[model samples]
Target: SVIKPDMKIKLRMEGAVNGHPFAIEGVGLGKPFEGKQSMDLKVKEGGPLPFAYDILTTVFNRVFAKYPENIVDYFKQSFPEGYSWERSMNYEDGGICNATNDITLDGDCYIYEIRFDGVNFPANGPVMQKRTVKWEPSTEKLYVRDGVLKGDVNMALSLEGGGHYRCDFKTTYKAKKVVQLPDYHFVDHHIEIKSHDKDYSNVNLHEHAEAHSE
Candidate 1:
């Protein structure tokens, strides 16, 4: 029960290279979007969690606090980098949106496709990219019958025509059952990473630990 009815969520972004700094952006989820607003997150050289899973877990936990069930399948689908998974979502285009999932634990790679409202492109166009997520779990703290996640994102824009970029992201979320931690709560959701690569060694377990630590 880590999520409360009145809980708030936020999203942040950053960019890094060879573990160096670049750009950064943090946005409150309660804000409104005007036009195609895009911001950069600055990451210091050799920063932690500068990868995709880092970003996803960070972002997912914020939303999961109030809706843990929204992420069960997502976490289960997470495999090593290059692994393949798929998810179908209903779209306004009268067709289901399919995503090619590929995520690793190392926070080094990712690939996914998402349907968009076309505010930045077409009315019902889709956005796809190959990105990376890195995790930096905490070693000093441990979960006490609860699940916690913390990490950073290192997204690599692998689009055509030089439509490529990178970003750094981070977040923290916790979930638990009433019986285990009577005062705590549970979120029944998971994560999915869509990608074309078919490998699964990039996953970094140490990062996952750091991300989930409170």
Candidate 2:
């Protein structure tokens, strides 16, 4: 009941490519590559490379494609007992960003600890960056009911000749109550923002006063 078959999702990526600062915005996932990727791909004086867009779109598409195609069936087989389990998606592509999804399902909670540890080089060079996503609410906050998924992408875009520069992006779901998207929905949506995100805080339990009320 948490994920809907037609639920929509959005995709976005921001970082530098080949030492040239760049960003691909409004790049729709799953959906056809039309206006969705229409965002102006502007970069530094080096200008955007021919493979720039391809590098972004292709990697994203592949990562999301790993989600369970048949949701209901996947759950039946994977979590037959109603909840509690884990899964992983490992992709070894020499793209700008190679991503992996470490999934964990517990009761009504689902977690995707996504890590992108690679960089994109021209079709003619060595590939390499290290980026990771950390959900804001954390695992503990989502222990029961449904909630929004807010993640912060920490990116370390590498340089072809030497070190690297840092770029960050923000991602969140459109539907406020949905924790994640279904197969189709998970593949076709994206949004954007700028922020530095992180961890869980405080733990407070409340109950009736032990002996008296002040």
Candidate 3:
């Protein structure tokens, strides 16, 4: 999707790195989602990609066989308001995949684990209680490929394929942060992105979500 107005997401973060093991609470103001711009996945090597018709009209279609809105929704911008994620990628280049969903910590490597409290909604007002969701650095790897900013998740992150490249990635994201709010609604959605390359590897991320209806 095209760029929309960005919103400010505030949170605190902490974790371990070789030299800079520290923590701080900060804001992740979402900007334009820079990627291949939310496209469908490929079932095979050089296979057919999912078209806009498929997502909204088919796969993500809940009302009917066609889920057109899902196509636009998935491919469009991802904000910190209503999403959960815990995966590993080239942190510097992986920014586009998660957009404003991840957290930041000034450390030796760009390593940090993150969590969130879910979106707030008026429907939940009557029984709304404190809720939290977070993800720590599980494992990490190197991502290498001729990535284009306007490509799929893989291409967008510039991941290589099938052990073609050795990994330079090494780190763990520890440190945790939590926020409480009543302005958003609670919808459960978890997304962990994996790549086809060891160089472009998968960092198994540990994630958690907790809530109560008090």
Candidate 4:
């Protein structure tokens, strides 16, 4: 099955300072935000069509199909006020993939580096005290591949004396063929992102919605 361009994709997130281990849930999409961030995505179905990666689309399709109601419900509870998101890419069948790099800690400052498909997008970016990380093809994990898509992140303390962290993520995918559609799929869509040292109180839960046919 292929996703149409008219269908809208939605993402929601929530973070709190509760007791216990730092825990996070929900999805990541849309523009960056301040404290208690949230995103609302609108994905239109159908278009000129960039060949999609079969495996990648399958993974996203399944996730949305299996937990359609739960996914929407979770987002609603996570962000009561609602948020906004954008369509980062558009492809047909199996032509797109996504990667994510997440960091969490509670204590002094720390430095981190991540290379996705071999690109360093955030070589010298600033880190945040508390953060939430998310990406599409939700199951896709970033890595170096012949030095194609790569990224790096650095985390250090601010002059004010607070914890800092950063995440660098990238994605690489093939375009659709002339006749056949792409086929890339994977398991694992939900991830909890947070800082370790601090209590769950200051953690965020973000959830990404799966694609659906309209």
Candidate 5:
């Protein structure tokens, strides 16, 4: 778990509405109205039963996290199979709010049974399906493991343009190293930092060992 100050947090994400994708990224601590979205993906075979009319549509949304927390920098929504996944919460405003269900691991993914007032949404519900989670980096450290920073700090997290709801939206968050956040930067050796912020170095140590390599 990386617990950074609100000033150091940054956020970027993609999620869709009516098939139109939007993207929002800037300081994760300030200005919720900015984090909107845009998109594109394929509708796989054996289509979902709920999405009868709109059988082919892609989707996207961004997350925002603010202050430090007792449960770490992220939110862990737990369920069946003794397994749990996380999302950015305790944000300046709202990172993740209620909406949970049974979760089963499929190989390297976390599939949730996302229910809404008993089966609903975009002609879908019951199973949010697999967007995948439980990120474990080997050797190199990242984020927290319980309720602490593994480096450093959240603020509201609008789902960008206040996009309503859907159970079929899938997402993938990446971690990459950059120079600095909008307000702060360490002058020392730049100690290791942890976060599920979704935007990271996106590079394996095998490929690049240098930190903040522009």
Candidate 6:
């Protein structure tokens, strides 16, 4: 029912780190994700670690790690190649939670919603034909209570590609536990990372194998 073309999904992230206010908002980057697409987003303010480590892992844990099957349901043409992310947290306050060089967050909360829409293009070469891709944004609410940070992530994706290649799917990520936060600290760091990694291929194998038979 909540599926439509040209749908303007307003993705947003609002939360606090060490009592420091942090928020972000952006629109979907639709249509262009056919051939190859990748994105990297992060948070900057006063806190233990930058928002990238906490948020990326949290979202991956909840959506990518949990709903991998769902991803294949929407995007069957492409496979994730080392889609790994990592982060580090060090709480100087020692109030809510304390740690250094951690892979997860604890004692804090977040409201997260980003885009995950794409399919594979070519299997044997760098140029892959974009398969049916979908677009929909779902907010992941991370709240802390009873020494646990948990919430729900309602994600939906719609795909349209190739002849007779259209599919739509919606996944409600169940509430799960995540990391934490703190009270007071002053750390300012803004980092912007852009990756344009490429895939390699060897086209001579097919020709060599075919020549032997001829």
RMSD of each: 17.4, 18.8, 20.8, 19.0, 17.1, 21.0
Alpha carbon lDDT at 46, candidate 6:
28
| The candidate that achieves the highest TM-score relative to the unseen native structure | 2
Give the lDDT ranking, best first. 2, 1, 6, 4, 5, 3
Q: How many residue pairs clash in each candidate?
A: 68, 10, 20, 54, 41, 12
Give the CA lDDT, 0 to 100, for residue 8 in model 3: 30
Candidate-wise lDDT, in order? 0.26, 0.28, 0.21, 0.23, 0.22, 0.23
Higher-ranked by TM-score: 1 or 4:
1
lDDT of 3 by residue, 1-214 (tens): 1234332333433322212232333323332222111112222111121111111000100000111222333112222222233323232311111111243323211211343111222232211211111221222112222220111122111112211111122222112322221211111212233222231111221112121121
- lDDT (C-alpha) at residue 137 in model 5: 20
lDDT of 5 by residue, 1-214 (tens): 1211121222233333223333333221211122211222222222222221111111111112221222221212221122222232121212122222333433323333332111122222211321212111212122433332222211111132333223221122222221112222111111112232222212111111111111
TM-score of each: 0.22, 0.28, 0.24, 0.20, 0.19, 0.24
Error of 6 at 61 (Å): 11
TM-score winner between 2 and 4, please give it.
Answer: 2
Local distance difference test, candidate 6: 0.23
Q: Is candidate 3 or candidate 4 better by lDDT?
A: 4
For candidate 5, which ten residues in a row score worst on lDDT?
A: 205-214
Model 3 regions more than 4 Å off: 1-4, 18-21, 32-71, 75-81, 89-214
Best candidate, lDDT: 2
Query: What lDDT does candidate 5 reach at residue 60?
Result: 12
1-214 in candidate 1: lDDT tens per residue? 2222222222232333223333332221211111011112223223343223232222222222221232232232223322223323232323222222222222321222211111111222222122333222222221233244332333332333444433332323232212222122332222333221232212211111111211
Worst 10 residues of 6 by lDDT: 205-214
